[model samples]
Target chain A: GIVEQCCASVCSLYQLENYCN
Target chain B: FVNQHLCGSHLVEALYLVCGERGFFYTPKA
Candidate 1:
């Protein structure tokens, strides 16, 4: 789901970094 | 790039990104 991909995608980039934060 | 890279997975899975089973001639393909 985009809900999971997009979040997990850039979640490791810039401000989106950090897991499950 | 199939994990969190997007557009790198199964058709039924990534189908949600561009399709929703709600854009085809029948109702979509997702």
Candidate 2:
């Protein structure tokens, strides 16, 4: 589903950007 | 599902953006 895919992309980027802090 | 290490707010915000962008309204379901 687009919702899940989109969410996964955003959160994945968030994780990288925030360095998991 | 997101990584457990992520904050709660990230999920909320992610849903908001992803759902909204897809022309779907987002609301917490209890």
Candidate 3:
């Protein structure tokens, strides 16, 4: 049913500023 | 069920990061 696919897809974005600090 | 790596890193490993395959395997998947 629709219950299994209700979750949002995983989307990631690693900002460079966070890593370069 | 699979996901991604969007979280921050606070890992402190006691090992080195290898960047290649050798001897038995080749190519990178990590």
Candidate 4:
């Protein structure tokens, strides 16, 4: 499922790219 | 078929540290 893929990618890269504090 | 649980929200807060800003412009984004 593409939704699952997108969720996985987002969860994996979230803290690395979007978290800043 | 979705409702078991995915994203959960927890109590959190943010802290910011800023220094003096040297600005000469009069226009602001607000």
In terms of DockQ, the best-performing candidate is: 4
Ranking by TM-score: 2, 1, 4, 3
Give the alpha carbon lDDT tens digit for every residue of B1-30 in model 3: 225332222111100112112212222347
A1-21: candidate 2 lDDT, tens digit per residue: 233443444435443323211
Q: After best superposition, candidate 4 residue B5: deviation in angstroms?
A: 7.6
State the C-alpha lDDT per candidate: 0.35, 0.42, 0.23, 0.25
Each candidate's number of clashing pairs is 7, 0, 0, 0
How well is each residue in B1-30 modelled by candidate 4, as lDDT tens digits? 122324332101110111113311222236
What are the clashing pairs of model 3? none
DockQ of each: 0.06, 0.07, 0.05, 0.08
- What are the per-residue Cα lDDT tens digits for candidate 2 across B1-30? 465444455554654554444433433545
What are the runs in model 4 whose C-alpha is more than 4 Å off? Answer: A1-10, B1-5, B10-30
Summed over model 4, clashes come to 0
lDDT of 1 by residue, A1-21 (tens): 233545445422222222111
lDDT of 1 by residue, B1-30 (tens): 244445333433434434554532322247
Docking outcome class, model 3: incorrect
Off by over 4 Å in 3: A1-14, B1-30
By DockQ, the candidates rank as: 4, 2, 1, 3
